Write an enzyme that holds these catalytic residues in place. Structure first.
Site, PDB file in Angstrom:
ATOM      1  N   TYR A  72      28.776  38.589  35.080  1.00  0.00           N
ATOM      2  CA  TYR A  72      29.229  37.292  34.594  1.00  0.00           C
ATOM      3  C   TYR A  72      28.479  36.074  35.148  1.00  0.00           C
ATOM      4  O   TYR A  72      28.862  34.908  34.875  1.00  0.00           O
ATOM      5  CB  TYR A  72      30.733  37.140  34.877  1.00  0.00           C
ATOM      6  CG  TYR A  72      31.583  38.182  34.193  1.00  0.00           C
ATOM      7  CD1 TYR A  72      31.504  38.410  32.825  1.00  0.00           C
ATOM      8  CD2 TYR A  72      32.480  38.971  34.930  1.00  0.00           C
ATOM      9  CE1 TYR A  72      32.334  39.358  32.204  1.00  0.00           C
ATOM     10  CE2 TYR A  72      33.273  39.927  34.306  1.00  0.00           C
ATOM     11  CZ  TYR A  72      33.177  40.138  32.954  1.00  0.00           C
ATOM     12  OH  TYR A  72      33.962  41.122  32.339  1.00  0.00           O
TER      13      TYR A  72
ATOM     14  N   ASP B  90      36.327  48.067  40.734  1.00  0.00           N
ATOM     15  CA  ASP B  90      35.367  49.165  40.897  1.00  0.00           C
ATOM     16  C   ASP B  90      34.430  49.028  42.111  1.00  0.00           C
ATOM     17  O   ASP B  90      34.058  50.081  42.668  1.00  0.00           O
ATOM     18  CB  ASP B  90      34.459  49.350  39.669  1.00  0.00           C
ATOM     19  CG  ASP B  90      35.167  49.846  38.432  1.00  0.00           C
ATOM     20  OD1 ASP B  90      36.264  50.421  38.483  1.00  0.00           O
ATOM     21  OD2 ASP B  90      34.598  49.690  37.330  1.00  0.00           O
TER      22      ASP B  90
ATOM     23  N   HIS C   5      23.435  44.410  34.399  1.00  0.00           N
ATOM     24  CA  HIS C   5      24.356  44.473  33.256  1.00  0.00           C
ATOM     25  C   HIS C   5      24.988  43.108  32.979  1.00  0.00           C
ATOM     26  O   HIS C   5      25.002  42.228  33.844  1.00  0.00           O
ATOM     27  CB  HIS C   5      25.453  45.591  33.431  1.00  0.00           C
ATOM     28  CG  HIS C   5      26.545  45.242  34.434  1.00  0.00           C
ATOM     29  ND1 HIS C   5      27.599  44.391  34.143  1.00  0.00           N
ATOM     30  CD2 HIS C   5      26.722  45.612  35.727  1.00  0.00           C
ATOM     31  CE1 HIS C   5      28.380  44.268  35.214  1.00  0.00           C
ATOM     32  NE2 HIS C   5      27.855  44.968  36.215  1.00  0.00           N
TER      33      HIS C   5
ATOM     34  N   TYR D 293      38.445  38.185  27.355  1.00  0.00           N
ATOM     35  CA  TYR D 293      39.339  37.806  28.463  1.00  0.00           C
ATOM     36  C   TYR D 293      38.587  37.068  29.565  1.00  0.00           C
ATOM     37  O   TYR D 293      39.208  36.391  30.449  1.00  0.00           O
ATOM     38  CB  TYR D 293      40.064  39.029  29.028  1.00  0.00           C
ATOM     39  CG  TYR D 293      39.520  39.649  30.325  1.00  0.00           C
ATOM     40  CD1 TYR D 293      38.490  40.637  30.312  1.00  0.00           C
ATOM     41  CD2 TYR D 293      40.086  39.301  31.591  1.00  0.00           C
ATOM     42  CE1 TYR D 293      38.035  41.168  31.510  1.00  0.00           C
ATOM     43  CE2 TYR D 293      39.621  39.852  32.794  1.00  0.00           C
ATOM     44  CZ  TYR D 293      38.617  40.754  32.764  1.00  0.00           C
ATOM     45  OH  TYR D 293      38.233  41.285  33.997  1.00  0.00           O
ATOM     46  N   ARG D 294      37.269  37.240  29.577  1.00  0.00           N
ATOM     47  CA  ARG D 294      36.416  36.845  30.695  1.00  0.00           C
ATOM     48  C   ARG D 294      34.991  36.949  30.197  1.00  0.00           C
ATOM     49  O   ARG D 294      34.695  37.838  29.378  1.00  0.00           O
ATOM     50  CB  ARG D 294      36.623  37.775  31.909  1.00  0.00           C
ATOM     51  CG  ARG D 294      35.927  37.361  33.214  1.00  0.00           C
ATOM     52  CD  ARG D 294      36.340  38.412  34.242  1.00  0.00           C
ATOM     53  NE  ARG D 294      35.873  38.165  35.578  1.00  0.00           N
ATOM     54  CZ  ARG D 294      35.995  39.048  36.580  1.00  0.00           C
ATOM     55  NH1 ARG D 294      36.617  40.182  36.396  1.00  0.00           N
ATOM     56  NH2 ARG D 294      35.534  38.745  37.788  1.00  0.00           N
TER      57      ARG D 294
HETATM   58  C1  LIG Z   1      28.344  44.830  37.591  1.00  0.00           C
HETATM   59  C2  LIG Z   1      29.845  45.289  37.733  1.00  0.00           C
HETATM   60  C3  LIG Z   1      30.853  44.310  37.809  1.00  0.00           C
HETATM   61  C4  LIG Z   1      32.213  44.594  37.836  1.00  0.00           C
HETATM   62  C5  LIG Z   1      32.620  46.024  37.886  1.00  0.00           C
HETATM   63  C6  LIG Z   1      31.660  47.055  37.805  1.00  0.00           C
HETATM   64  C7  LIG Z   1      30.288  46.724  37.710  1.00  0.00           C
HETATM   65  C8  LIG Z   1      29.247  47.822  37.709  1.00  0.00           C
HETATM   66  N1  LIG Z   1      33.951  46.320  37.937  1.00  0.00           N
HETATM   67  C9  LIG Z   1      34.906  45.385  37.960  1.00  0.00           C
HETATM   68  C10 LIG Z   1      36.331  45.773  38.012  1.00  0.00           C
HETATM   69  O1  LIG Z   1      36.690  46.997  38.040  1.00  0.00           O
HETATM   70  N2  LIG Z   1      37.193  44.755  37.944  1.00  0.00           N
HETATM   71  C11 LIG Z   1      36.854  43.456  37.956  1.00  0.00           C
HETATM   72  O2  LIG Z   1      37.715  42.544  38.004  1.00  0.00           O
HETATM   73  N3  LIG Z   1      35.557  43.028  37.925  1.00  0.00           N
HETATM   74  C12 LIG Z   1      34.556  43.957  37.915  1.00  0.00           C
HETATM   75  N4  LIG Z   1      33.231  43.559  37.901  1.00  0.00           N
HETATM   76  C13 LIG Z   1      32.928  42.114  37.924  1.00  0.00           C
HETATM   77  C14 LIG Z   1      32.761  41.711  39.461  1.00  0.00           C
HETATM   78  O3  LIG Z   1      32.068  42.713  40.273  1.00  0.00           O
HETATM   79  C15 LIG Z   1      34.039  41.595  40.314  1.00  0.00           C
HETATM   80  O4  LIG Z   1      35.101  40.975  39.565  1.00  0.00           O
HETATM   81  C16 LIG Z   1      33.886  40.840  41.658  1.00  0.00           C
HETATM   82  O5  LIG Z   1      35.026  41.163  42.431  1.00  0.00           O
HETATM   83  C17 LIG Z   1      33.882  39.325  41.432  1.00  0.00           C
HETATM   84  O6  LIG Z   1      33.115  38.683  42.380  1.00  0.00           O
HETATM   85  P1  LIG Z   1      33.789  37.997  43.657  1.00  0.00           P
HETATM   86  O7  LIG Z   1      34.956  38.813  44.037  1.00  0.00           O
HETATM   87  O8  LIG Z   1      32.653  37.841  44.662  1.00  0.00           O
HETATM   88  O9  LIG Z   1      34.235  36.543  43.120  1.00  0.00           O
HETATM   89  P2  LIG Z   1      33.287  35.165  43.150  1.00  0.00           P
HETATM   90  O10 LIG Z   1      31.960  35.421  42.516  1.00  0.00           O
HETATM   91  O11 LIG Z   1      33.382  34.574  44.580  1.00  0.00           O
HETATM   92  O12 LIG Z   1      34.162  34.226  42.199  1.00  0.00           O
HETATM   93  C18 LIG Z   1      34.263  34.447  40.793  1.00  0.00           C
HETATM   94  C19 LIG Z   1      34.606  33.098  40.161  1.00  0.00           C
HETATM   95  O13 LIG Z   1      35.886  32.590  40.498  1.00  0.00           O
HETATM   96  C20 LIG Z   1      35.828  31.169  40.721  1.00  0.00           C
HETATM   97  N5  LIG Z   1      36.060  30.985  42.139  1.00  0.00           N
HETATM   98  C21 LIG Z   1      35.851  31.886  43.111  1.00  0.00           C
HETATM   99  N6  LIG Z   1      36.232  31.436  44.329  1.00  0.00           N
HETATM  100  C22 LIG Z   1      36.701  30.194  44.102  1.00  0.00           C
HETATM  101  C23 LIG Z   1      37.246  29.115  44.925  1.00  0.00           C
HETATM  102  N7  LIG Z   1      37.399  29.304  46.241  1.00  0.00           N
HETATM  103  N8  LIG Z   1      37.619  27.973  44.314  1.00  0.00           N
HETATM  104  C24 LIG Z   1      37.456  27.796  42.976  1.00  0.00           C
HETATM  105  N9  LIG Z   1      36.966  28.743  42.172  1.00  0.00           N
HETATM  106  C25 LIG Z   1      36.560  29.903  42.682  1.00  0.00           C
HETATM  107  C26 LIG Z   1      34.455  30.758  40.272  1.00  0.00           C
HETATM  108  O14 LIG Z   1      34.528  30.638  38.854  1.00  0.00           O
HETATM  109  C27 LIG Z   1      33.622  31.973  40.553  1.00  0.00           C
HETATM  110  O15 LIG Z   1      32.470  32.090  39.674  1.00  0.00           O
END
Ligand SMILES: *Cc1cc2c(cc1C)nc1c(=O)[nH]c(=O)nc-1n2C[C@H](O)[C@H](O)[C@H](O)COP(=O)(O)OP(=O)(O)OC[C@H]1O[C@@H](n2cnc3c(N)ncnc32)[C@H](O)[C@@H]1O
Ligand SMILES: *Cc1cc2c(cc1C)nc1c(=O)[nH]c(=O)nc-1n2C[C@H](O)[C@H](O)[C@H](O)COP(=O)(O)OP(=O)(O)OC[C@H]1O[C@@H](n2cnc3c(N)ncnc32)[C@H](O)[C@@H]1O
Lengths: 525, 525
Positions: A90, A150, A389, A470-471
């Site tokens: 994403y 995951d 991906h 959804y996303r």
């Molecule tokens: C490539 C991939 C991705 C993946 C997955 C399997 C593969 C092979 N399986 C997933 C699963 O089973 N379920 C799921 O929800 N997502 C899955 N993904 C996508 C991704 O790996 C994960 O969701 C990952 O956990 C998300 O990244 P992270 O946990 O590091 O979150 P982030 O990048 O920090 O934040 C995402 C967005 O949320 C908003 N955000 C985040 N923190 C804040 C704060 N503090 N304040 C305001 N907004 C915030 C932003 O929009 C940010 O981009």
């Protein structure tokens, strides 16, 4: 060309950097090309470079987040908050708007503030990963378990803020979120729910508090920077058993889903969030494309049959987990076998019955479904060289016919643009997240471009058919938001009104979810 | 004097009334003192007159709601939307701001738009009562059941919009709300979630949609007039059993709650929303105060012992329901007996074991907990002449010491102001809604002022102890909101900003949840 916030000069930017370093310290502000490479999207989409950060700032406290926000307001600098920044599929950590500063809250705000064993919850800073929380719980010999996606390297908080999902009965992460602390776009700090009541012990106990309930507004959102979040944690059951059901035909999808619904809608005998994964998803987890087919185009059918035969998997593979005393597990498994055993060619395997290569996915699900975080799914990205991906993630009714139509629509564009379609249906009570991962060689400009164009087509075509996502990815947030346009874009206009009121200077993550503040609307960003 | 909207003349109000009549019809606009008497708070609080409506308009459709809102913007007329307006204990149908016009959506927008048997949901207009939905389900031989509060004459929609509660496993109404349609404060219509995607069939399937999730902002809220709402409906289980546990001593509260928590937090064996009701609540449901005591002041210990002995009830009475296959019910009930039986004096009764006067409450709970609506609880109001109640509704941790502290705190003041304290703890997974109903003679201006003063003291005193209210009466909304003042009243400032942005003219239910638009702030009504 140095990356600069829009309309902000080299001089003004340099001064802001200095102001930022005064708040967080020198080490914790990155601004050189070499340092910023690590914060580019790891799985870039489209040929042209996009989503370029101008800097990264790593605060250690809420007070510092407030000062950063105040500085940003004075200079007109956009701020893109992330937790751990592992939103791969994403955009990764990369900002929707090129020139934004990343606020990487999780680098130093990574404390587990509370795990409460009696009331079963955690209060967390954004830097807490699922591995971190797992280690805490194990160390304290907790009776609680987490719910992880995951990949365990993400943020409990971060994932919840994008309404991400896992696979235990606590799989709907936003449903279990209870209480948050957020820095609003002009730097004021606010607590939601019972956290707004000074001295309350109930911040992680009762989510709503009093008056209009706002926590949802900080998810998939640009209304602030979240610095603390609570989440409920389930009690670990006495026993569990995972299982796989393999289904031979591409065509079995409809009957699988139709049989599933009645067994899932009451949370029993399908207690956890089942996943229904196609052979491409499962082969990619344990093997490279070239093991089955060397050839630039869509995999021919005989290469598909060889995938299935060698891994001893079906075209569709259903994974689930049962929890409770052993006699409850045996009743529920018995029911599951009886119902799904009506499909010709279905075969059943517990987590104790496969030790082979194709069974690695089952063993990985058995971990994830029991709240044991894993990075084995990273192996998907070795499917092709420099593998990346993107997630195309439509919502589907838990209806076999709808699920087949979506699969056929996606399959067909996947073939047209030459990209493998790995599918994972994530099955809630009354809906499924139909997650379509397209695996591609991120080094080839043409492949990155075909990914972008294919996914732009799929978003439009799925919406003409009544399905929304959804996303989504940075690259598609405008197109996806444009699909939710009932009543002449009523929902978007409401979101803009709120955005403009809370963020008059247009600072926080502009363009998240297609929501642009006044100074940015009407532009090509 | 004629009740008039603040700052609006007799001549302008007459003009606005005729315009309302142009929209809805002459018959559907009420404006004489006689007509408006039925829309006064039936359980009035305070000696002085308060919460006086200037008129009642009953729209037939969403379009008419839009036209009404447009008119009220042009004329500066505040509008107080209700569904059925049975919010008794919190104001009834009466508006927080005297002079407002009540928009009684439920009078004519009373259609069941869809009941979907396969996915287990309903799409409803605001005038569908619990009785109406039950009747539908019965008529159509549905396999679904509804979840209802104590009284069936309210609105499935209206109750959910105030974050009301019932007692089945779907008793958190707001949790199961899925999609809504709302006329915003300047007359624009919006649909939430998947309903924002033209042609989606997932409006009642997947709540969140895409982007920030807004539905919660239309609960306990003055941000719009809701015209449609979806709700999930649970499948009816094959069997159920209700039970009563009587506990003899006021001091048993601590232990009851402490034993309860581990049996509740996993949703098993305590599957439903248990209620713990004190003797005043149960006695009032089946008897008048004068059967037990006819002196002055609080009932003496001897009189309380008589209520218990004659009704064969405890000081504290725990009611629950179990659902599923018969062997599961029996296993769960054995577990409940074993745990709670440790409290000396505890006695257990199932709904098959008691047919006497005291058991009337158990019989009513056995209907309510199986989604069969009832009006038997209206008998509580016969406890004293002209009987009414007010709800003082603190949130409690599911901790015995906390509950005991709350009970003693409330009892001390109840005794001080000579008001009987009927208690119903409504037990969620990780929290309790500790509902305190004070039953009083509504005709007596002294009693009504004592109610007002006592509840103001309790709001303050609870907040000093770190407790806040989940829901409250018109008369207390400013005081309650004033307790949620972490961060220098950050939560309220945030609400006010959104309010002013969506409602520039200050039209919708000014003062709801202590949230007044700019034109009314500081005026003290
Ligand atoms: C490539 C991939 C991705 C993946 C997955 C399997 C593969 C092979 N399986 C997933 C699963 O089973 N379920 C799921 O929800 N997502 C899955 N993904 C996508 C991704 O790996 C994960 O969701 C990952 O956990 C998300 O990244 P992270 O946990 O590091 O979150 P982030 O990048 O920090 O934040 C995402 C967005 O949320 C908003 N955000 C985040 N923190 C804040 C704060 N503090 N304040 C305001 N907004 C915030 C932003 O929009 C940010 O981009
Ligand atoms: C006296 C009493 C009350 C009571 C109860 C037992 C007794 C003896 N037991 C209850 C229970 O078990 N659970 C529960 O939630 N409440 C209980 N109550 C309180 C009351 O009876 C009920 O909650 C009742 O269902 C509420 O009344 P109704 O359902 O008629 O809802 P309303 O008055 O129309 O609306 C309440 C408020 O919500 C907002 N609202 C309503 N409709 C709209 C629309 N269409 N748009 C915008 N806002 C809306 C308003 O704030 C309204 O005042």
């Amino acid at each position: 060309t140095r990356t600069l916030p829009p309309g902000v000069s080299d001089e003004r930017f340099d001064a802001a950097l200095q102001r930022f370093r005064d708040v967080v310290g020198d080490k914790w502000v990155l601004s050189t090309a070499d340092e910023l490479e690590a914060f580019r999207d790891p799985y870039p989409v489209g040929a042209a470079e996009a989503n370029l950060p101008s800097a990264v700032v790593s605060p250690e406290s809420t007070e510092q987040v407030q000062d950063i926000v105040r500085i940003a307001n004075e200079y007109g600098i956009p701020l893109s908050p992330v937790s751990t920044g592992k939103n791969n599929g994403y955009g990764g950590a990369a900002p929707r708007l090129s020139g934004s500063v990343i606020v990487k809250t999780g680098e130093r705000m990574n404390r587990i503030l509370e795990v409460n064993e009696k009331y079963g919850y955690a209060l967390l800073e954004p830097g807490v990963t699922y591995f971190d929380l797992y280690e805490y719980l194990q160390s304290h010999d907790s009776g609680l378990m987490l719910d992880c996606p995951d990949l365990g390297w993400g943020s409990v908080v971060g994932n919840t803020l994008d309404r991400g999902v896992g696979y235990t009965p606590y799989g709907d992460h936003f449903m279990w979120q209870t209480g948050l602390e957020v820095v609003l776009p002009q730097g004021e700090v606010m607590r939601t729910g019972m956290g707004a009541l000074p001295g309350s012990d109930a911040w992680q106990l009762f989510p709503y508090g009093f008056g209009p309930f706002p926590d949802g507004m900080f998810t998939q959102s640009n209304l602030g920077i979240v610095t603390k979040m609570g989440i409920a944690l389930m009690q670990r059951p006495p026993a569990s058993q995972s299982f796989l059901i393999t289904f031979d035909k591409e065509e079995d999808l409809e009957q699988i889903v139709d049989i599933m619904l009645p067994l899932r809608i009451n949370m029993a005998p399908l207690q956890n969030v089942p996943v229904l994964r196609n052979i491409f998803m499962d082969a990619a987890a344990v093997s490279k494309r070239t093991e089955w087919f060397d050839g630039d185009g869509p995999m021919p059918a005989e290469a598909i049959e060889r995938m299935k035969k060698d891994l001893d998997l079906g075209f569709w593979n259903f994974y689930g987990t049962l929890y409770g005393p052993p006699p409850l597990i045996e009743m529920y498994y018995g029911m599951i076998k009886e119902a799904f055993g009506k499909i010709p060619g279905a075969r059943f395997f517990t987590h104790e019955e496969r030790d082979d290569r194709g069974g690695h996915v089952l063993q990985d699900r058995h971990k994830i479904n029991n709240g044991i975080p894993s990075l084995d799914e990273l192996q998907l990205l070795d499917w092709v060289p420099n593998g990346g991906h993107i997630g195309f993630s439509p919502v589907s009714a838990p209806d076999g016919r709808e699920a087949m139509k979506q699969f056929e629509m996606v399959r067909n564009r996947a073939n047209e643009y030459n990209k493998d379609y790995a599918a994972q249906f994530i099955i809630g009570l009354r809906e499924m997240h139909h997650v379509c991962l397209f695996i591609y060689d991120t080094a080839i400009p043409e492949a990155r471009e075909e990914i972008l164009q294919m996914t732009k087509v799929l978003v439009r075509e799925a919406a003409e058919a009544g399905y929304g996502e959804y996303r989504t990815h940075n690259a598609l947030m405008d197109d996806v938001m444009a699909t939710f346009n009932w009543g002449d874009g009523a929902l978007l206009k409401f979101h803009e009104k709120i955005k403009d009121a809370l963020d008059p200077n247009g600072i926080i993550a502009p363009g998240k979810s297609g929501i642009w503040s006044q100074r940015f609307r009407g532009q090509n960003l």
